[PDB]
Design a protein around this ligand. Structure first.
Ligand SMILES: CCCc1nc(-c2cccnc2)c[nH]c1=O
Ligand SMILES: CCCc1nc(-c2cccnc2)c[nH]c1=O
Lengths: 546, 546
């Protein structure tokens, strides 16, 4: 019974195969059939290619030896190689053209999700070309989805030598009969088969996956659309910056490129961006997913005024200063969305671009107290319940699992009224003691938030809602300004508090505003519709932020 | 008696002044004298420029209002503005041409070093131009050297209004007579003078600094060359990555751009790079200054084999994988220099470029045991003393302050023999109990290393020297390779262990190798000759790593 799946790289996890390009080059240059593939494998185990695949030499040392084999082969075939014949060029192009075979990777992901130990076993080289970063990136994206990456040039062994298979079995801690092995080269399959492993000769992906699903008994083909890659907290780079003597800010960091600062809402975490962090880093950005003040590993001072917009924005500026960042793109959701519009209004020079999920930008009304304005809309009643220090802390902190299980639900799963919260005397008075687990979250994701909130609880988070008068006075100073830097507003159809229609007058203050819209999406945007969120953000980033 | 110094930005900390460009533009376009400066200040306190300087409007809202004032002014002066007259262009160029007035900044640094509270007081705007990042960077570099940055557009007050001066005095917690105030605008000096502050009208920097030194009694002019900016550990962004279940790696992070991974030697810290971190971030790089395995906040497992080159390099690859970095430039010193050459030999695809300080790259001799090779050179005797577990730990851990004070000395300060260390039975047998403080370090820098080494001591650090046979066997696999990626070798004239002549055959294995050389430099390269190190690295980075 199978418990491990092994994949080749070239022609299996990555397409098109480099060997395929040698043939394509022969045809394009009208060279004798197999001349290049013959020069490539020249000398077999004693040849230049074996030495390269074993790690004896690097790719740049191999290029001249391949040139010589190509000359020798053409001499024997009584033919001439063209004037501008360059092996470097042929390989540079082939390596660059090679992309991840998404359905193969998707099938590997599914097997690992169902308990399989997965591995990549590849005959590869030590790449020292000026353009090696493209291959480095490919391997990076691919390798993180597997338990093991076994590279011929790193182990000093090569397929089809029997020892690399014995090494593989030892790495997997598995007996041959427990292993499925997938290769596009029949000769490299032969030793695994001889050892007793299940083998699949990969020609077209679809037939390979039909074979793979028949042998594992797990559906790999015609599967529903998979969720984006998420984050395992213990595998992340965690960062800490002191912004002032008693305030430290925590963030999770992933990727290289322009800095993208992610700002969560209430009562959330850096983890609310779990589905965006890998996707945004893969799109070519340096992601900084914050634990906002009062949350997670960030400090939680008890004073209400430590949570007004002016102080929070000043701290985020200091955060940039301490990291040596002149700018960041600011993406926010809910309370993070509010802060992000204020960063754009007060510090435009420090904000590369600004994006908000659900949170509209509505200028302050100087002719009306903010407390009057909140009373005008019944959906904002929960905010008045959040006013009195201690009351909402008591209900929210009583049972953490019940809190997050009641809150983090989709539009078709609500257990929460909201409206007449004050009258009913609580957010959870008509909610069950043991809510069912929402389709958006697993038990373990709820427990990550539970553990996070055990440190400081809900005082610091609730204080974000306790600065209406302070926020309003500060916001009134910005009344003559417009937001003229790149800006994106993303509305969610089924958010009943931050409704799409509330954002309708935004173009008056943000003339060049760009928009996104997510259908059948509730308040918890990132986890409700991750794929859609990722598509809207990546497209807006590549077009407007670099 | 003075204790605070206040500087204007435009025409004082930054040159040339923007007002100066308005005049230069009038002359270039043969416009009436003062036409632009008149349109700029039009309406005085009621005008567009005051509203901008107060924060009522952003720079982009101000551009059209300036265009109108320019049209109105030309109409009155019975003149016409040229066909391609654009305020945006004039200001974009002026802002971009404006650089830090280095001797003014240097004088501000000296006053702060002698106990003064320093501040920048400026009439500035909220910059939302597409090219705002240039100004953002200027302010970032400048602001970090001062206690306070007071910006007119942020306080809603402007020079010469008396309230901004009262705000300044309150920010400084100083009485007027304790303040020197420097401005290039006589009108903006007048209220500070009226309050009783010492004022200096800045025309040419030199006369301003003569006035400033006469009034403070501190030498600011004709001063010796200042050391580069250093790091205050508590003001840095600290990062932590788990590379394996019991191994966590700590790093300090600063800047944006290509990732530059700094690898210290024995028995050092991320702090050994204190003079390089600010300089490298300012040059446009994202710096990752490591605490290598066994040091500082990084894990220190006790097993010798956890410190062989193979394991250390694999961990650094995982470090890159966990941060989402396909590559980094690897710069190392001493043991870090050795690791960095091995990263280039085994993982060329993950190494953008490689640089070593002092540490040469010498291929392993397969016909000689490494223990024989170390015995051949008398300068390597201390390495044999480091072999027996516990002996060197005992002497090095006995008195931490004495350890670092004896070790971290310049070429003309040695208290350490080295050679016949085993025979003498210790590194410090002929060294004082209370060494004098070396010219390279302050008391406080020694105490930072003392506190760092209190956590794990010297076992983990010493274990780097305890894998000769393991390292040699692994290195022998690389014997057929060459280093063909961008590489820099920096030799130090007075390093008596890692002597410049030891690097003489490097071009045989690294044909495209670039070199740097530092005269009158001992083993502790970074702190011995920071300025020279920074110049060699920045120049090599901008030319070879991007
Ligand atoms: C139908 C309830 C789902 C929901 N929750 C919120 C919410 C909850 C708690 C805090 N902030 C916002 C907002 N809008 C919503 O539709
Ligand atoms: C004259 C002594 C200065 C010195 N120290 C070392 C050294 C000390 C401790 C550890 N590793 C290296 C090397 N070369 C040197 O000139």
């Amino acid at each position: 019974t199978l418990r491990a799946a092994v994949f080749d790289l070239d022609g299996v996890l990555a397409l098109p195969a480099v060997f395929g390009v040698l043939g394509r080059t022969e045809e394009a240059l009208a060279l004798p059939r197999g001349l290049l593939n013959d020069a490539f494998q020249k000398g077999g185990p004693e040849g230049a290619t074996t030495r390269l695949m074993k790690g004896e030499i690097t790719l740049s040392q191999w290029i001249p030896l391949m040139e010589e084999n190509c000359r020798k082969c053409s001499e024997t075939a009584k033919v001439c190689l063209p004037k501008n014949f360059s092996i470097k060029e042929i390989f540079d192009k082939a390596i660059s053209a090679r992309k991840i075979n998404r359905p193969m990777l998707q099938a590997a992901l599914m097997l690992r999700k169902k308990g399989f130990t997965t591995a990549i076993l590849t005959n590869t080289w030590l790449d020292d070309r000026a353009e090696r970063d493209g291959l480095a990136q490919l391997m990076c994206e691919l390798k993180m989805h597997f338990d093991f990456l076994i590279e011929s040039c790193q182990v000093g062994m090569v397929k089809p030598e029997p020892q690399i298979y014995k090494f593989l079995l030892d790495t997997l801690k598995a007996s041959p009969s427990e292993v499925v092995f997938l290769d596009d080269i029949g000769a490299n399959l032969k030793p695994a088969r001889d050892l007793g492993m299940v083998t699949i000769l990969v020609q077209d992906t679809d037939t390979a996956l039909k074979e793979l699903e028949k042998v594992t008994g797990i559906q790999l083909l015609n599967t529903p659309a998979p969720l984006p890659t998420s984050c395992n907290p213990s595998d992340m780079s965690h960062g800490y910056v002191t912004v002032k003597p008693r305030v430290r800010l925590h963030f999770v960091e992933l990727g290289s490129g322009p800095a993208v600062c992610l700002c969560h809402g209430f009562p959330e975490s850096w983890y609310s961006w779990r589905y965006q962090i890998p996707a945004l880093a893969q799109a070519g950005y340096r992601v900084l997913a914050m634990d906002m003040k009062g949350y997670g590993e960030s400090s939680a001072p008890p004073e209400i005024e430590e949570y007004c917009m002016e102080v929070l924005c000043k701290e985020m500026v200091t955060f940039l200063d301490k990291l040596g960042l002149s700018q960041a793109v600011f993406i926010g959701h809910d309370w993070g969305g509010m802060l992000v519009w204020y960063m754009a209004l007060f510090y435009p020079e420090r904000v590369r671009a600004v994006a908000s999920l659900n949170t509209p930008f509505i200028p302050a009304n100087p002719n009306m107290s903010p407390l009057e304005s909140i009373k005008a809309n019944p959906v904002f009643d929960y905010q008045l319940y959040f006013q009195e220090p201690g009351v909402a802390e008591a209900e929210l902190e009583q049972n953490l699992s019940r809190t997050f299980k009641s809150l983090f639900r989709a539009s078709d799963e609500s257990v929460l009224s909201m409206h007449k919260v004050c009258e009913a005397g609580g957010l959870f008075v008509n909610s069950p003691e043991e809510p069912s687990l929402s389709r958006m979250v697993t038990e373990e994701e709820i427990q990550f938030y539970v553990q996070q909130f055990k440190k400081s609880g809900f005082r610091g988070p609730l204080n974000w809602y306790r600065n209406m008068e302070r926020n309003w006075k500060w916001a009134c100073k910005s009344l003559g300004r417009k937001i003229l830097i790149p800006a994106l507003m993303v509305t969610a159809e089924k958010d009943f508090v931050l409704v799409p229609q509330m954002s309708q007058h935004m173009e008056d203050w943000i003339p060049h505003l760009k928009r996104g819209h997510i259908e059948d999406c509730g308040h918890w945007t990132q986890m409700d519709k991750p794929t859609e969120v990722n598509q809207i953000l990546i497209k807006w980033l590549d077009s407007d932020a670099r």
